[PDB]
């Protein structure tokens, strides 16, 4: 019962570092640290929450019946099941740890710069797809109107086609059908422009799915790279001269 060399005692580490350690952990996971204010704060994982249970000393409760911290923790070890050990588990010296840190920090910035790039493409592509969907909904409405114009021309011209055929005015009949040709050919241009956009959107939708796939692939590899980098840094901080 050393109480300093103990695995669950982390000493000078903040509440936020504790929250990172107890993230998604099972009920009964715990660790002890120096208070944020000597005094000691025990943090216990219960009901997806991290409970802070303060440790008092004068010689936790109204009468402090425990001699040392280990005796209090072990008595309860709603039960103190899984302790967060200070055993992460490579290089013995400082020249080797630094050379590895530099290797990982280099990898971390390249992956991070690549992720950022991917994210700009993700955002650009999402926006473009939204732009195309609005434009297709606008072509849809445009075609309806142009088709309604055919219906109107038909509705009207039928009575005039008879009235001009009985009058033998072949020149005027040709005028009306030249207009109908102009109208129907325009609807063809609008329909094919909608068609070209629908295939442009189909391709871009696929390109979005591929960017999304690539980002879900690098996100955990980037997180782990940062975790190892931060670990080598902490090791180098610890295995070096420390003071104010």
């Amino acid at each position: 019962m050393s109480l300093q060399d103990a695995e669950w005692y982390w000493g000078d580490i903040s509440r936020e570092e504790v929250n990172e350690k107890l993230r998604d952990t099972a009920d009964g996971t715990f660790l002890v640290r120096d208070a944020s204010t000597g005094d000691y704060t025990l943090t216990l994982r219960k009901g997806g929450n991290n409970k802070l249970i303060k440790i008092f000393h004068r010689d936790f409760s109204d009468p402090l019946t425990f001699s040392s911290v280990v005796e209090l923790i072990n008595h309860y070890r709603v039960k103190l099941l899984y302790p967060v050990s200070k055993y992460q588990q490579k290089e013995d010296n400082i020249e080797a740890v630094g050379k590895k840190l530099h290797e990982y920090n280099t990898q971390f910035q390249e992956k991070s710069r690549e992720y950022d790039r991917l994210y700009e493409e993700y955002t650009r592509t999402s926006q473009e797809i939204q732009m195309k969907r609005t434009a297709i909904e606008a072509f849809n409405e445009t075609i309806k109107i142009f088709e309604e114009q055919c219906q109107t021309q038909e509705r009207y011209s039928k009575e005039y086609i008879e009235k001009f055929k009985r009058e033998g005015n072949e020149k005027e009949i040709q005028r009306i059908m030249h207009n109908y040709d102009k109208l129907k050919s325009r609807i063809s241009e609008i329909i094919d422009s909608r068609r070209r956009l629908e295939e442009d959107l189909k391709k871009q939708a696929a390109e979005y799915r591929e960017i999304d796939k690539r980002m879900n692939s690098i996100k955990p590899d980037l997180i782990q790279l940062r975790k190892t980098r931060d670990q080598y840094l902490m090791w180098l901080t610890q295995k070096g001269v420390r003071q104010k």
């Binding site: 903040s14 509440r15 936020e16 929250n19 993230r23 998604d24 009920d27 944020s36 204010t37 704060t41 009901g47 997806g48 929450n49 409970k51 802070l52 249970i53 303060k54 920090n105 991070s112 994210y119 732009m131 609005t134 434009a135 909904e137 606008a138 849809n140 409405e141 445009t142 109107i145 142009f146 114009q149 055919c150 109107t152 021309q153 038909e154 509705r155 009207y156 011209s157 005039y160 005028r175 009306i176 207009n179 102009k182 109208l183 325009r186 609008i190 939708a205 999304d212 796939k213 690539r214 879900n216 692939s217 996100k219 955990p220 590899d221 997180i223 782990q224 940062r226 931060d230 840094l233």
Partner: protein, 1008 residues
């Protein structure tokens, strides 16, 4: 939907000078007419009906006056063009075509709905189509608020009309800080009152020595007496025949407040500037005011298109995860997928998170009932189901990486208090950039409106009927059935910051003394956190305590509106405190935050949205920023429906301000289009060429119509008159922002500013800079009210859209590098000496030192991006200006892992030489010792107001900034302000940080 760009047509930013238009006549004929891009509909319609006679079936065509044009807009809407004075290029057409129709329906309403839809950048018609009953109920029920506000505006006309348009720009307290009162000679203000005298409009000035506490009427009185006079002087008739205005802007003194309480006057005293006012007649202002009339919309004439208690349901909670349509994962990179779920009250789980079994990527099917460690009657009113599809890969040791792919949140009870039942289909959202947590409980509730996304099928329990949450009478029922060293402990907890650790012991302690708590009402946030929300027993009891709970200061109430307090009772109490104690000054000061917490609300209809909308509709200064904060977020699909509906009701009841807002919106759209051309088609073009294009475009009648004669979105009291085109420029930087210059058209502009200068930015997100500058203004305000004149000069910054914003251009400012470029270390001091020769030198060194102290403290606390000679600017008069703040808090901790607090603003020798007035060994001087004291005082003033800052930041967690995503991100402010320490230890910490950064020089007096 909202338009893809600000272009004149789809995929064409600017129409050519002449353009061919397809004109679909009502007789079925199609005519191709060539039109000028700036031609109006009046012109085009006349030219069309002339050409139409040269076409078949023209005998069927009625008079050109019986028709209107309709077409498809970039918003995919078919719009009827009743306003034929509009120009072709301004129509926002999808394709260049126009259809001739006969105007039908309610003309008046169609016109208003188009005006509303234009202001919001979304067609009003889209809301009518929405199936959700919550939406249709919101649209109908909000009209109560609209009616009410409009009625209060005609209660005492025209005075109540003028009080809405021109609200008094006053401080929250009539009381003057001693450093402000000391600038007064026997408590008297020397004011200059101006008159515009008819018929030649001549300006006559009258200098008055009046008391600071003089109500505006009394100020008018002394000006009468100083003109006529007592020997024939007893005119009390002037009380209601004259009003005061500020020379150079639209700020009026319409209310009985001591003159010193008016911000313009309070600022004049502090700066020692003479207040230049303008006396004018009440009638000449009241006659400018139109009668604002609210019309009930057509949807208010229409209606929207067995029951058990929750407490009588004797079962546990369980949710059936059926399947997900798909996920976007590389099958070789990831092993399995699963659905992580949780039951939350705010951001805290009510029971442990429950996962489904792991399945293949290709097979997202579970058909699994997940069991929750919660009894159904114990489920609180604000309980939510937070879920996400996660991927898992275990390739390195026993270690496995867990990444979210898509998330979604849903309210377990609805706006009518009905518990969810049956099969439910939820479209999930993309994971926010920077979020690493597997759940997103801070995120919005409801299905993603994008249906081309992963859709998760769900199923809840059916209890043979409609389960409804218990009534307040039933809840009050369940609550009727369950000394000195403790009093000192209770006060100690109430003083602690909102993010301070609360131990389980302290929670059991606070809950035990829950009835004594009323003596210290400010402990309510600490007590609400001690409650076990997953226990119907404690909640029912909490509801009865809050019911009678004494009101708290708004600065404390604002906390109960953040994402940690989701309960409708708690939130209701908070809204009542604001209704009671929140002044229009403070509402204006924290509007960014109050608009942000609307996104944390479970439902569309709530007490917060009504209170805010009421205040927006009874104060046009509040209305202006309310509109601009909501409109800027309209591109964001997580809030576009909520913000669009709220903007519809605002625009329906704001009256004549809609016309002014529509002019601002159109001026802004012309600027977005212009800059969009420079960023795309003209990106690879020289400055000279770009400027040539800019001047040629701005010169166009449609551009000059739109960019001149409107109100400034930065300050609606500021009028933007004619554009001084010879002073407008595209900046040399890669972003290519615009420096725009407008004449101030006010009759007395020379007494304020002759020109209004604004930087228009399209491409960079300005929300973070807008927040940073807002935090500085708040800090500046705390300092002044504590007696410190650290002149910050927080210039205007406003985000107006998706990476679109405005920054107020500070006059005669130069970056430290500009000064140095045109050197040694005294170069800066020399520049300042040259610009402030003679008597005015002391004040320039004074100004530079105070602004320097203010910025040392502010940048240290906030941890903004490192300062250099290019992001620090100085004014000719000494005043320092910081620009381009970038990131804040601990942005660097994630990037380099180095755990510490930085000193963004390390004072260079160049800066020390200035503070020491040219001295050798600068840190020894009495100048540097005065500066150090200023810093210490500023730091402690903010530390004393820590709760406000922690709250303001907490109210932003769901905005979009990756350094402002969690509570563990606000932790930085807790370190820089050393909140877990004593005021003395905190001051020692600030001092050590300055010492370590500057390599000595920072001393003190232990007691002195």
């Amino acid at each position: 939907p909202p338009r893809p760009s600000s272009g004149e047509l789809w995929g064409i930013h600017l129409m050519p000078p002449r353009i061919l238009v397809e004109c679909l006549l009502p007789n079925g004929m199609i005519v191709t007419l060539e039109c000028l891009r700036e031609a109006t509909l009046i012109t085009i319609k006349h030219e069309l009906f002339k050409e139409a006679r040269k076409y078949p079936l023209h005998q069927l065509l009625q008079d050109e006056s019986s028709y209107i044009f309709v077409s498809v807009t970039q918003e995919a809407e078919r719009e009827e063009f009743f306003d034929e004075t509009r120009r072709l290029c301004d129509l926002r057409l999808f394709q260049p075509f126009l259809k001739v129709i006969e105007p039908v329906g309610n003309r008046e309403e169609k016109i208003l709905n188009r005006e509303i839809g234009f202001a919001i950048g979304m067609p009003v018609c889209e809301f009518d189509m929405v199936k959700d009953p919550e939406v249709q109920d919101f649209r109908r029920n909000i009209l109560n608020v609209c009616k009410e506000a409009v009625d209060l505006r005609d209660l005492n006309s025209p005075h109540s009309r003028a009080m809405y348009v021109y609200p008094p720009n006053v401080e929250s307290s009539p009381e003057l800080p001693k450093h402000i009162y000391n600038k007064l000679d026997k408590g008297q203000i020397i004011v200059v009152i101006w008159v515009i005298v008819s018929p030649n409009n001549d300006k006559q000035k009258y200098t008055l020595k009046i008391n600071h506490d003089c109500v505006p009427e009394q100020v008018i009185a002394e000006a009468i007496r100083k003109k006529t006079r007592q020997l024939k002087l007893c005119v009390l008739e002037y009380q209601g025949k004259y009003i005061l205005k500020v020379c150079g802007c639209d700020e009026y003194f319409l209310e009985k407040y001591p003159l010193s309480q008016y911000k313009y006057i309070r600022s004049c005293i502090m700066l020692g500037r003479m207040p230049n006012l303008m006396l004018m007649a009440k009638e000449s202002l009241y006659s400018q005011l139109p009668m604002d009339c609210f019309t009930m919309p057509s949807y208010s004439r229409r209606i929207s298109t067995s029951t058990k208690s929750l407490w009588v349901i004797n079962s546990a909670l369980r949710i059936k995860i059926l399947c997900a349509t798909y996920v976007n994962v590389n099958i070789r990179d990831i092993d399995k997928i699963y659905v992580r779920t949780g039951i939350y009250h705010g951001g805290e789980p009510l029971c442990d998170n429950v996962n489904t079994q792991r399945v293949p990527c290709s097979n997202p099917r579970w058909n699994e009932w997940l069991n929750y460690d919660i009894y159904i009657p114990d489920l609180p009113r604000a309980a939510r189901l937070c879920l996400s599809i996660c991927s898992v890969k275990g390739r390195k040791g026993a270690k496995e990486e867990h990444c979210p792919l898509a998330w979604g949140n849903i309210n377990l009870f609805d706006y009518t208090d009905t518990l969810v039942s049956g099969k439910m289909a939820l479209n999930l959202w993309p994971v926010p950039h920077g979020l690493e947590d597997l759940l997103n409980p801070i995120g919005v509730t409801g299905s993603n409106p994008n249906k081309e996304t992963p859709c998760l099928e769900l199923e809840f329990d059916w209890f043979s009927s409609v389960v409804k949450f218990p009534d307040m009478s039933v809840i009050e029922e369940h609550a009727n059935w369950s000394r000195e060293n403790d009093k000192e402990q209770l006060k100690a907890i109430s003083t602690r910051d909102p993010l301070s650790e609360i131990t389980e012991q302290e929670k059991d302690f606070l809950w035990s003394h829950r009835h004594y708590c009323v003596t210290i009402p400010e402990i309510l946030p600490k007590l609400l956190l001690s409650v076990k929300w997953n226990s119907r027993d404690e909640v029912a009891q909490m509801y009865c305590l809050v019911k009678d709970w004494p009101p708290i200061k708004p600065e404390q109430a604002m906390e109960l509106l953040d994402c940690n307090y989701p309960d409708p009772m708690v939130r209701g109490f908070a809204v009542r405190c604001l209704e009671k104690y929140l002044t229009d000054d403070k509402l204006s000061q924290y509007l960014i935050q109050l608009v942000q917490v609307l996104k944390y609300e479970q439902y569309l209809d709530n007490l917060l949205v009504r209170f805010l909308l009421k205040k927006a509709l009874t104060n046009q200064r509040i209305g202006h920023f309310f509109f601009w904060h909501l409109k800027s977020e309209m591109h964001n699909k997580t809030v576009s429906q909520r913000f669009g509906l709220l903007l519809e009701s605002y625009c329906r009841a704001c009256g004549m301000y809609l016309k002014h807002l529509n002019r601002q919106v159109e001026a802004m759209e012309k600027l977005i289009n212009l800059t969009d051309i420079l960023k795309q088609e003209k990106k690879d073009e020289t400055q000279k060429v770009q400027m040539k294009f800019l001047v040629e475009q701005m010169r166009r009648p449609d551009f000059m119509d739109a960019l001149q004669g409107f109100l400034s979105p930065l300050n609606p009291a500021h009028q933007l008159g004619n554009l001084r085109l010879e002073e407008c420029e595209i900046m040399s930087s890669a972003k290519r922002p615009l420096k725009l210059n407008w004449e101030n058209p006010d009759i007395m502009s020379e007494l304020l500013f002759q020109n209004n200068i604004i930087m228009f930015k399209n491409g960079d997100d300005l929300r973070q800079d807008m927040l940073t500058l807002q935090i500085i203004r708040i800090m500046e305000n705390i300092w002044q009210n504590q007696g410190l004149d650290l002149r910050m000069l927080p210039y205007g910054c406003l985000s107006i859209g998706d990476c679109v914003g405005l920054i107020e251009w500070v006059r005669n400012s130069h970056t430290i590098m500009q000064i140095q470029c045109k050197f040694n270390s005294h170069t800066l001091h020399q520049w300042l000496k040259d610009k402030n020769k003679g008597e005015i030198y002391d004040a320039a060194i004074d100004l530079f030192t105070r602004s320097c102290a203010g910025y040392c403290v502010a940048t240290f606390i906030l941890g903004i991006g490192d300062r250099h000679n290019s992001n620090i600017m100085v004014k000719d008069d000494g005043q320092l200006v910081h620009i381009d703040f970038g990131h804040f808090l601990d942005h660097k901790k994630k990037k380099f892992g180095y755990k510490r607090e930085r000193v963004p603003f390390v004072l260079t020798q160049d800066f020390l030489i200035v503070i020491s007035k040219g001295a050798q060994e600068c840190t020894k001087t009495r100048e540097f010792e005065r500066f150090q004291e200023m810093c210490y005082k500023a730091y402690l003033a903010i530390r004393q107001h820590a709760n406000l800052f922690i709250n303001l930041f907490s109210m932003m967690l769901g905005s979009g900034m990756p350094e402002l995503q969690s509570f563990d991100d606000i932790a930085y402010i807790r370190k820089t302000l050393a909140l877990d320490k004593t005021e003395q230890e905190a001051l020692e910490y600030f001092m050590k940080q300055m010492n370590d950064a500057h390599h000595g020089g920072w001393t003190t007096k232990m007691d002195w």
